């Protein structure tokens, strides 16, 4: 049952696991100033990036407890109870509009608050599948916070470099990925196609399978090549289609 806890009494380790991984493994944990069961992941062997996090909350951001390297690397999240939004296309095929546009919004907003965070956080690793659900009937959140610091790639991340409308791309390509239940680029195979498509500024063909005019043209938008040209997250959440309802 209970084999661990952090320095402080805080967060109680039990003995069950609740997710593997090639780097990642879960276990249930427990919050033992609020008896809430959370997530606590030990990563196989983040100074200022456990400094941000710790101290970060947002109705659309998992939220990210503690972390520190036991004696591998351990954090205790929320604990996520729903499956992602890869899952979620699978379970249902396709997503309506209603939908659609409400999750949107919501990672926009999740994605807004750590640009603006001082300094900013860049995900930087953003996907349908660390993209979490509430409920059936509920809100999402952007999960996998701590991670990205050990396709989706805005093309001037191959030059590694990396700048807030990185996540900008992503998010087109997720709201792509949830208006064509596929995996972007999948006409493609290997990376270095990709590459090569997505540096000659050649959209994944997948875009061509989306219905909604509008959401076709943020998508667009989201995915240019040179970033300066990239909408913000202010133009993003301005368009007709995230003001209309």
């Not at 208006?179 to 680029?185: D, F, G, H, Q, W």
Request: charged share 30%; hydrophobic share 35%.
């Amino acid at each position: 049952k209970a084999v661990g806890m952090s320095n402080d009494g805080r967060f109680l380790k039990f003995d069950i696991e609740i997710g593997r991984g090639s780097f990642k493994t879960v276990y249930k944990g427990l919050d033992t100033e609020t008896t809430v069961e959370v997530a606590w992941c030990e990563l196989q062997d983040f100074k200022e990036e456990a400094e941000m996090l710790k101290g970060l909350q947002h109705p659309n951001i998992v939220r990210f407890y503690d972390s520190w390297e036991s004696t591998c690397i351990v954090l205790v999240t929320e604990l996520m109870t729903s499956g992602t939004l890869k899952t979620y296309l699978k379970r249902f095929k396709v997503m309506k509009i209603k939908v659609l546009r409400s999750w949107c919004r919501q990672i926009l907003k999740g994605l807004q608050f750590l640009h603006t965070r001082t300094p900013p956080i860049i995900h930087r690793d953003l996907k349908c599948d660390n993209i979490f659900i509430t409920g059936p009937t509920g809100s999402v959140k952007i999960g996998d916070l701590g991670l990205a610091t050990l396709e989706f790639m805005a093309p001037e991340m191959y030059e590694e470099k990396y700048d807030e409308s990185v996540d900008v791309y992503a998010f087109g390509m997720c709201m792509l990925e949830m208006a064509t239940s596929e995996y972007p680029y999948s006409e493609c195979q290997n990376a270095a196609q990709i590459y090569r498509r997505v540096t000659s500024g050649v959209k994944p063909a997948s875009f061509d399978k989306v219905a909604i005019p509008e959401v076709k043209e943020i998508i667009e938008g989201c995915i240019r090549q040179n970033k300066d040209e990239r909408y913000s997250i202010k133009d993003l959440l301005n368009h007709a289609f995230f003001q209309e309802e």
